[PDB]
Homo-oligomer: A and B are copies of this chain.
Amino acid sequence: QVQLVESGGGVVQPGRSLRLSCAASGFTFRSYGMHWVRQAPGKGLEWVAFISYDGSDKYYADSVKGRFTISRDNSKNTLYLQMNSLRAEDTAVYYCARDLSAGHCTGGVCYTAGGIDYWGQGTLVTVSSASTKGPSVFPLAPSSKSTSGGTAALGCLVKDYFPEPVTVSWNSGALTSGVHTFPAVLQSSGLYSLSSVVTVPSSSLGTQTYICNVNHKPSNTKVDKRVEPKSCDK
C-alpha cells in the first residue's frame, strides 16, 4: 500500500511565516512529481502548485504568485511548502498528493501534468481573529415523553468553542451503533457548536450508564458530567 501523511497546520497568526511538510510511505517518492493543494471548508478544491520529480521544473498559481515557496528533498523522502503571508480565504486543509502520470502528453503538448488518485491524511491551517477559546459543555437529557418501549435520544451538547476538530464516540469507542455526530456549526460569534447522540431502546432507562465523550483536541478540553435523564422534581 502507498499512503501520504501531512502535518504541521493549526493555530497560526496572520502575516507571519510557517513551514509545512508531506510524509510519504509506500512508493519511490523521488520517482514522482509532488503536489500542493488546499481545500477550504465551505468551499471546494483550491490547487496551489506543483513540482517536477527532480525539482528542476516548478509550476505555480496566479492568485498567490510569489507569495508562497515550494520545495522537496529526495533523501529524506519528504515534501515541503514554505507558505507565507496568510490571509482570510486561505483557511483550508492542505492535501499532499501523488501524480497519476508524470509528464504524459497528447502527442504535441508535453508538460508535467497533475493527476491524483491517492491522497494524504490532511493538515489544516487556522488563521482567524477568534482565539483558541475553551468551551462550555451541556448535557442533553431525554424528555419524559419517550417511554414504554420507545427510543429516548440523549447525550451531551458542546457549544461556543474554537477551533476544529472535535470527535465524539459513545462510551469512549465501546459503543458505535447509533453514534451520529452532527457537523460543527460556525456561529456569528466566531465560535463552534454541534450535536452527537446515540439511539438506544427506552428499556435502558435508569439502568444504562451514559458517559458523553468530547475530544476537542487543538484546545484539549474534556467534560465528563454524569449523564442521566433529569428527574421530575419541582
Residues of A participating in the B interface, judged by any CB pair closer than 8 Å: 207, 209, 231, 233-234
Contact = CB atoms under 8 A, between A and B. Distances in A.
Contacts of A207: 231, 233-234
Nearest to A209: B231
Identify whether the interface residues of A are mostly helix, strand, loop, or mixed.
loop
A207 B233 CA distance: 7
Nearest to A207: B233
4 contacts: A207-B231, A207-B233, A207-B234, A209-B231
A115 B207 CA distance: 64
Contacts of A231: 207, 209
Contacts of A234: 207
Nearest to A208: B231
A231 B207 CA distance: 8
Contacts of A233: 207
A27 to B, nearest CB: 18
A220 to B, nearest CB: 16
A223 to B, nearest CB: 12
A214 to B, nearest CB: 16
Closest A-B pairs by Cβ, 4 of them: A207-B233, A207-B234, A209-B231, A207-B231
Contacts of A209: 231
A234 B206 CA distance: 9
A29 to B, nearest CB: 19
A233 B207 CA distance: 7
A176 to B, nearest CB: 16
A207 B231 CA distance: 8
A233 B233 CA distance: 24
A209 B231 CA distance: 9
